[PDB]
Design a protein around this nucleic acid. Structure first.
Ligand SMILES: [Zn+2]
Ligand SMILES: [Zn+2]
Ligand SMILES: [Zn+2]
Lengths: 62, 237, 89
RNA sequence: GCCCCGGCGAGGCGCAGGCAGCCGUCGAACCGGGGAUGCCCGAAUGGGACCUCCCGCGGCUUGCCGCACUCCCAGUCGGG
RNA sequence: CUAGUACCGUGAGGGAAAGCUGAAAAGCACCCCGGGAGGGGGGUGAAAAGAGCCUGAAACCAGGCGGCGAUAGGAGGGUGCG
RNA sequence: GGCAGGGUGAAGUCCCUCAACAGAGGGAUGGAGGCCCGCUAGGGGUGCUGGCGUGCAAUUCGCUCCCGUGACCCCGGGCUAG
RNA sequence: GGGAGUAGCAGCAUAGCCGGGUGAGAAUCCCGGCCGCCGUAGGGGCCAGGGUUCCACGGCAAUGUUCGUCAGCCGUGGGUUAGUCGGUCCUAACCCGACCCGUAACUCGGCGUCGGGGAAAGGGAAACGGGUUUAUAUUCCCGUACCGCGGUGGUAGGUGCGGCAACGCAAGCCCGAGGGGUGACGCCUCGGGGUAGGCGGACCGGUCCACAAGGCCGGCUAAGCGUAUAAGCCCGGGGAGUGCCGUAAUGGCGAGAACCGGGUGAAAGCGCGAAUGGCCUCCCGUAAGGGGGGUUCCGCCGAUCCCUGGGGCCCGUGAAAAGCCCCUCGGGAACGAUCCACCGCGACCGUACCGAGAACCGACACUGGUGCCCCUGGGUGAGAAGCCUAAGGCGUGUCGGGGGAAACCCAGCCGAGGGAACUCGGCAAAUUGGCCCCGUAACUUCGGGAGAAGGGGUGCCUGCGGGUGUGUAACCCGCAGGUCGCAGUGACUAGGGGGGCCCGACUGUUUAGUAAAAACACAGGUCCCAGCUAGCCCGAAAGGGUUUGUACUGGGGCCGACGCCUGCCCAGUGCCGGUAUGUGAAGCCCGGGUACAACCGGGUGAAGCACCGGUAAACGGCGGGGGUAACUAUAACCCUCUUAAGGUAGCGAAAUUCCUUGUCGGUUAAAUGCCGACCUGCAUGAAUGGCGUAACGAGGUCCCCACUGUCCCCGGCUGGGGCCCGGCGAAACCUCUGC
RNA sequence: CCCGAAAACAGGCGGCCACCGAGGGCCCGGGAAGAAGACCC
């Protein structure tokens, strides 16, 4: 059905790989951009106020 | 609610987009720039099937080795000489301005304004008729029964389009219709709106029936123009 | 078999080894014979081969010694006759 | 972890209680100040990136310098 | 405290636990048993406080001690006595 | 990139005999089809309302049943986003 | 904590026993033998993914559903070698940047121009065999080759020939341009030539078998270099119609056949490579090591592998570019190769192992999924079927030991007499079954139904004939006779048939995980909008989809193969058109008012409304009465006034009917059933289609034949559990308790 | 006819032993008995 058996088709090519600028596995390989830092889509960093990721990385208060 | 198929077509997705990369090139006349009054000559090399033309095309080699495509007229042979210009003769396959084509002649691939390249009477099996000539305009009967006026410097080709009679043999099978609609990716198969749910269509519901007139005003907005759009009448006769 | 050899553009062959192993060999396919410009007939005196096979051949072993080797003899005679008949005046 | 100027005055070799051994009275470790070296990606910039790795063109003499885009001053040199 | 760490999610993101020997390592020489973890003798120390280390509660488990205990009816207690 | 094996026998192309105002019989070739049988591979999921139901499994197993040269099955590269 | 030393450690592949060894310790580790399983996959090769799981030595605290001396576990050391394999190069669908337009703006949206990316199964220079390591090898070593670039020395040629021709030749160098070919292509079907692999006979060695007869094993040869025919296509001669020539078939010929010669032109085979290389076997001290021999012939089958040719289908036409070969032209120098010989050089990354009933995903050493992605010996046999077996792999689809040890459950086998009396319902099980011959209905869209139905035969042995073929080679088709059994498609394989009704024309699709259908789609019928700066649609705009398009077209509805048909109503609701007047907002005008304005009144005033008309394969509707001619019922005919009109043909107790188990007939011993009719149609009806219909359906429903443990009425047997023994070891749940 | 000394008046009779040891069980060979126990030879 929709559960255990479709989980077997996760041997294709991955949706994300490592990013050269950010460091982590969020670079969309078919679109050509990163979902965490914006590399390939913007010179500037992805940085939203509703997000906690960069604050956590810098040990900051929300 | 949810969107209609004709609303989804406007956004231009692969599901609704034409596979033009499969087709022979576009078919256009040579420009007037090069044909001020030169009257070039050419020879037919080959006749070819086009998947996006409903008619066969012919390749022609010209003065300077240039190879162009034309809509093929009925009866044209490989190795014929075709002429384009004002002093060209009146023969099947030749292109002339409408001011040099007598009344009663069969014509195809006519231009709207001169230099356009060809817009009307292109389809397989069609033809138009010259009715009257004047200094201000020439008048032509089109395959819809409409009489239209053109500038007498608009170019046209003599004869009839090849490939007529397609619809005398029936399509017999859903599979053949599948292949035909996949050639040019038309939306196939087709659903009925009276059998959709209400979110999906102005028709729609458990009880499968249109609950109000199928005739719809010309001034209704998108999402509502389904049925008989601005119909002057309905029924058989 | 690697996926690149699971392609059917390789025309495999079964071959037995001096040591008795029966290995499989793979080769690429040979291109087709040359054709006439206008008539579309097959040309004689021109051999089939891949660039590798054709570059280890001298010039005179790759086409006949007569004018218009891109054509068949009939078409050649036609064009020659037309030239000479145009060259009267 | 390399160098120099000052301070302190005998021990020192990070969190980190070990083995084997080295540095220091030519003044160390440590502290204040000033220098050198400083791989790849990254605004990333000679050109490309489905993998932080690849591919070049000029000039000089194998090693070095220059070679992005949008502009200013100029002008077929250059300076910002 | 080797914490925005380990670990979860294709990703946007989410996110722990974990402090204390002794004044001094004086961190247990030597003997018997055991395949070995280890046990028993002996030692260090003011005190084993023994690295499974300050103090070391309750629930829970085992053994010993005291009372009852195989003809017998109530939410497990109250009053009066033996 | 793939689909064992077998059956039926459309158009097309013909042959023989008696003949003869007419005709009447008899033999082949050929290999179409959203044709047929088929646990070939592969795909699906009718009934037993079977086993299991803190399962081998957060949808599986077995018997039985259906399609199987096509509107067929599958792979690599791409597109459509609340 | 109790539950509990309990459940689970079975079911889809039931596997171990004997002897020996190691070790503290062995059902579980190693060696040998016997016994077993898989055998078009549980065998071999290799993507993605994983990332060291690979190799050796040393270990057993934990992990492994039990044990463990073992290990994908733990510790210590090691291991991936390329001019030729792949990436880099080309372009496909597609994406990005700069400029440009839009946006309050952007990390947002977009056309066109320029530029750049985009395939480890598309295109695309070049290597094969043997050996070597604990673990790598087309990568290391030996042998034998090839490609590109750059050179050294010579030669063809520049300044040369043979052939009627097709053509055959070493047949000049350097820059640029142009042209042609190749690269380069769908589906179905058939012929020919070969190969891998297999079968038979002889011979040589070895081995098994009480002798004999017989059985099994081995009997090898890569790239590269050099050599030719087939088909097809061509060149000369030749000169034909009551016709000749040919194919498996289609076919060919004065637009030049037969016939005679020739040219070009595949896969293969042959030769060198290459026989003290590989395999097999035989003889003495066994540490290195010694010597010797053999490596032969004939004949059949034959691919799903390779090459080459025909034919058929499309309202459907099945990639492009780089690169490579040839010709011509223009411009240069006088030298000089696409031929022979020799030398030099060739960068960067990958390369271990698994590749799945234990190395991937699913929380697991998960009966699932990813991958069956590529490939496979002998027999019977139509067969890649099922059954048996060789190679190769395994005894790790990781707990074992007992038993007349029950009841009961799961999966199976047989049952006297009767034969659906069971049940909502023949659910389930049973019956039939392969091949040859005979024979074959209603109905029909003449194609089918149809393997209709139904009936007869089949083994073994001894011989005799036929077909193609040169064949006492191979593969097929018939005949006679003798004989055995309860039974001869003896196991395996392997359809139960028929007659009615409803629905849907058919093949196809659907609610992943309670609905596979009567629901969707379908060919086809009919209606509507549109002449292109269109019609329909997206968007904030710029711009865009249909559009590389033009009425045989694009878009929008309803019905639903085929056959016969499709009646009346335009008053209402809607859509369309037209029109004098009327109404009609802002603006404009006029007047009054305000030292100016605000403000007041009138006029004009587009669309729309109103008014007049068309339209029902547009939405929908098709009623009412008051009265009946000859005696039992008839209102079957004719006027009427209500309203736009007043249900036509057909069908009817219906998948539509309330009363209803309607009435009559047929089917039963017995009928709330099924079929056929009757009309009182609560509340049928004509493209929200009406009435029929051959063929088809894991659709729904009724009957008949056969058959059966469904049932009378239950009985006996098999394997796995359950019970006992050893080992590991939970959870749901739980106020305290419990006649 | 079947069950029945746990019938709390928890019975009667005969015999053996005690006041080393009567008797009983494990064990061994087996069924007519049997899920473990029990029963019988
Ligand atoms: Zn990033
Ligand atoms: Zn030609
Ligand atoms: Zn020709």
């Amino acid at each position: 059905g929709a559960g255990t058996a479709p989980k077997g088709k996760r041997n294709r090519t991955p949706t994300h790989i490592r990013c050269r600028r950010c460091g982590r596995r969020a670079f969309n390989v078919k679109k050509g951009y990163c979902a965490a830092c914006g590399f390939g889509r913007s010179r500037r960093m992805r940085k939203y106020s509703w997000s906690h990721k960069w604050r956590k990385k810098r040990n900051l208060s929300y | 609610g949810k969107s209609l198929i004709q609303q989804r077509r406007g956004k231009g997705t692969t599901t609704f987009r034409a596979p033009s990369h499969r087709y022979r090139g576009a078919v256009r006349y040579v420009p007037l720039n090069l044909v001020q009054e030169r009257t070039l000559r050419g020879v037919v090399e080959e006749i070819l099937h086009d998947p996006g033309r409903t008619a066969p095309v012919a390749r022609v080699k010209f003065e300077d080795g240039t190879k162009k495509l034309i809509i093929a007229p009925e009866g044209v042979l490989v190795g014929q000489e075709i002429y384009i210009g004002p002093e060209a003769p009146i023969a099947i396959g030749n292109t002339l301005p409408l001011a040099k084509i007598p009344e009663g002649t069969y014509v195809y691939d006519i231009e709207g304004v001169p230099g356009d390249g060809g817009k009307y009477v292109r389809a397989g099996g069609t033809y138009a008729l010259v009715v009257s000539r004047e200094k201000d305009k020439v008048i032509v009967q089109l395959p819809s029964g409409e009489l239209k006026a053109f500038n007498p410097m608009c170019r046209a080709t003599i004869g009839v389009v090849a490939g007529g009679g397609r619809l005398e043999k029936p399509i017999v099978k859903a599979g053949k219709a599948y292949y035909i609609a996949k050639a040019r990716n038309r939306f196939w198969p087709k659903p009925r709106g009276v059998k959709m749910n209400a979110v999906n269509h102005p028709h729609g519901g458990k009880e499968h029936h249109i609950g109000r007139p199928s005739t719809v005003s010309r001034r209704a907005p998108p999402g509502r123009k389904v049925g008989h759009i601005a119909a002057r009448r309905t029924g058989r006769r | 078999m690697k996926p690149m050899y699971r392609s059917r553009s390789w025309r495999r062959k079964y071959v037995r080894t001096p040591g008795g192993r029966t290995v499989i060999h793979f080769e690429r396919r040979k291109p087709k014979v040359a054709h006439c410009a206008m008539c579309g007939r097959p040309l004689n005196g021109v051999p089939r081969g891949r660039p590798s096979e054709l570059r280890k051949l001298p010039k005179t072993k790759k086409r006949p010694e007569r004018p218009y080797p891109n054509l068949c003899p009939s078409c050649m005679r036609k064009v020659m006759k037309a030239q000479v008949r145009a060259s009267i005046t």
